[PDB]
Amino acid sequence: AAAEHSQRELDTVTLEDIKEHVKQLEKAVSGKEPRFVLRALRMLPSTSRRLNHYVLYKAVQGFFTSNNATRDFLLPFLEEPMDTEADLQFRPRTGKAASTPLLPEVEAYLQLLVVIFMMNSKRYKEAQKISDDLMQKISTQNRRALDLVAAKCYYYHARVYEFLDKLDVVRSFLHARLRTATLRHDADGQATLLNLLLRNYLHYSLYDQAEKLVSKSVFPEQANNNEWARYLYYTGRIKAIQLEYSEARRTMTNALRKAPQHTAVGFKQTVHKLLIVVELLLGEIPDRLQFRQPSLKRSLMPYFLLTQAVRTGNLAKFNQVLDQFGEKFQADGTYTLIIRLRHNVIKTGVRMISLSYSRISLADIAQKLQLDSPEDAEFIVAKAIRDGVIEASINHEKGYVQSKEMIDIYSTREPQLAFHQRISFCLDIHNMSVKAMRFPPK
Amino acid sequence: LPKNPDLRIAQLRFLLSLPEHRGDAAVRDELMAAVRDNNMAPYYEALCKSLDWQIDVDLLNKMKKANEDELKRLDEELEDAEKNLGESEIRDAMMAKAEYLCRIGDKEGALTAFRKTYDKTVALGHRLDIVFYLLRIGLFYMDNDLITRNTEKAKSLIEEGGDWDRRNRLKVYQGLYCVAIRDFKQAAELFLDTVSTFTSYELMDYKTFVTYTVYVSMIALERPDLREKVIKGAEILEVLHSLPAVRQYLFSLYECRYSVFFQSLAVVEQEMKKDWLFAPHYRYYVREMRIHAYSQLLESYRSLTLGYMAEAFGVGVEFIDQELSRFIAAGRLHCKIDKVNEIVETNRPDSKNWQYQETIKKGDLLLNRVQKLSRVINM
Amino acid sequence: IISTHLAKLYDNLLEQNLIRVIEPFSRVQIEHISSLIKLSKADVERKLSQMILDKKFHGILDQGEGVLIIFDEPPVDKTYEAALETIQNMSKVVDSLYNKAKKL
Amino acid sequence: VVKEMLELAKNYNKAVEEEDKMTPEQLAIKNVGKQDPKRHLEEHVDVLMTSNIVQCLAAM
């Protein structure tokens, strides 16, 4: 059929792609440079989609095919087509190459591909077993070049079990895997393992253990930008739930900055929602461009209403906002922070008063913030002066809030500190760029 | 260019759509007279359904029959041109059919007919005229995508080849759309460019064009350009001599007569509320004009008591205090209020300090870009 | 014609006189300058405000007590303007490198 | 030096954004005149940074 022949052609092109990736893996192991395995994994997400039964059937018929347990393991889980007319024997290894065992990296890549296909087919149980087998056989291996594919397979195994709605049978095993990766000095594998452990804790609400792990473990600096963004989001949630609001805001802004341009909509949605909540708690009204964006508009609409209520200062509006979308906030895992905002709303008003006025009288500030009595205003203002929200100094002798006089920052040292940080970053970037330089062997 | 579609009809429809003026009588009579004279049956039905009016059975049937027989005559002429006359005759017949389709208010049919005429039209000038007709239709209906695509097409046609008159008309059309989209800077630029040789009398008379130009220029242009291009502009001054209110409003800001400026600004807000193009942006225009006036007053002062500025603006101390606090909270005015002593102190950054802030911001952006590039390439 | 041109001449004369009378002072109070020019306090205040707002003689008024402070208007430090322009140029060069590096 | 480096950065922008691929290896050899790309480039960066660093260290 026309559709069938088109599918066969796409399968053949995918087979050519996998052959190219396996050749790259072999060249990487020969040259001991991750670059090639990194590119193979980079192409992996694209190949994850656009795969049917015959695709992987032909891949297993051509690759491997040594009568090994893999063929008797995945094939019983994946159907087999009839005698295809275009029986092109996809055999990159010919004669001696076929006899030689498949390279550990290449075999791991093929097992990862089959596991991804099982994921996309919702064969949760079969992917379970195939992932255990591949993980066990990769655990024995100790080649450095295998570590990146090991990290990818680790992440996909955690994902398969996450769809298994258990995500606890993995806790100890991923802890052990991450610890071994840390011992081995691996970077990508330990990065993915730490991110996945943090994700599991955040799912099951074990915040304290996650904070302990983040405090003790150290994330390698030379990690993937996407992995860094995921870790930043997880650490931002940990900090925000733990009352380190400023650090949470900074970390989540960094995570948003490091997001993959336009590749992951959902991660951006969640980061924006949590950042909006944290910023509202910290006393800053968030930017409207986020709410106006096309992809994030409908997702953040309840947060837009919440920000409206907070800025306007109408506690009743906040209550009706919670009534309509309270369950949505809960399902988003931000209900507790929203309640904290409900009881901290006065911080935004105090911050606005601090920005506007410089010597506001206590009675007038109490009137403006709809407080009942001036003494409550004094209490709230002092609490704000600690909370990093205001920089004033109450003069209780005459009861007026005297904001600190602004000073010429340039004549002070802060510009030197900012320039030092930026110059250090620039010099480090230059050193890193000239450091690799990928000079070929003559 | 042809007056069809008549933007006055769209303005009247919007005015009736406004809550207060929904029951207006004179606008009702004007719109009904326009519909009857122009015989807009589809437009009449759409307006009746939208405004919940009582459809006149006799008038509606008469208009429908007139539209039907006119369309039949146009189709007969098109068939005659197709059979006997050449390509030019058929193109003109289809152009007339599309023109009458726009006459009655059939948006979809008129647009499709104009598209067919454009497809069958070879002359560049006629293609530009078709684009102008579609742009006028879009303005009448406020179809953002249609107006944007057709403006791009008209720009491409002019770039390939185009007379100066078409360029001026397209400049005025872009200015009107920009005013309707709230990009007041481009509106001011285009309108100030075209005010000298305003030849697009179909969209709006010259007095309305000068009023719009003054409004958008004051919302966009700064004081030096405002003086050089609006205050001393011969055309704008000549037109304003016939519009005392607009002249007073414009001169209040430049001459520093703030109470009269606020009176004129209230009048202008009321006028724009009814206007069909400035209606969505009237609140923003008034807010930005007030912010501009406050900043202009504060530019020459470092610490002015709230009482003095309240007297200057002809408003109470409490109102000016509240408005100044609101505008400071949004980071628009560079001042900090001192309620106990009632003194407003301007905190305008020194040139060195502002330059340091700008360099910090731009360098942070560039460093983020460089870090992303290094991460992407280093693998 | 006479009215408009004489009003403009009056404006020019007031500007010149005010500039002449503020040259020695640095923090002159508005009342003294008005007395020196023999004009109403409000008129001199308005003219000074307009002059400052129009990049005329440099200074800032303070209605809290009333003075016409005059300073020397630091130049601008052209070095920072050049640095900002170079930063913009390098940002667009980084954009170009973004256009490159697509070929891996 | 900063103004001349701004002009040189404009020139470097023009040279790089062009990135003419009509045998780029030949382009880099047909425009060799000790000009914008790096010669009048980071040479000036080194001059500026050496002078500024030495002056600041001496001042401290």
């Binding site: 320039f419 930026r422 110059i423 620039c426 010099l427 970037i429 230059h430 760029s433 000239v434 690799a436 330089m437 990928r438 000079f439 070929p440 | 360099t359 360098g363 560039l366 460093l367 460089v370 590039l373 290094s374 390439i377 280093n378 | 640095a83 170079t86 930063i87 390098m90 060069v93 980084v94 490198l97 490159k100 590096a101 070929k103 891996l104 | 900063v2 480096m5 950065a9 790089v16 790096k38 480039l41 980071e42 960066v45 500026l48 940074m49 500024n52």
Partner: peptide, 30 residues
């Protein structure tokens, strides 16, 4: 700081050029 930014941009451009040269040589190898 401006000099450091210029140096970093130049180094990144040189790294991009060298990487593209190496990739082109490898591709033309086979």
């Amino acid at each position: 700081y401006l000099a450091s930014l210029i140096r970093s941009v130049v180094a990144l451009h040189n790294l991009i050029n060298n990487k593209i040269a190496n990739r082109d040589a490898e591709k033309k190898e086979g």
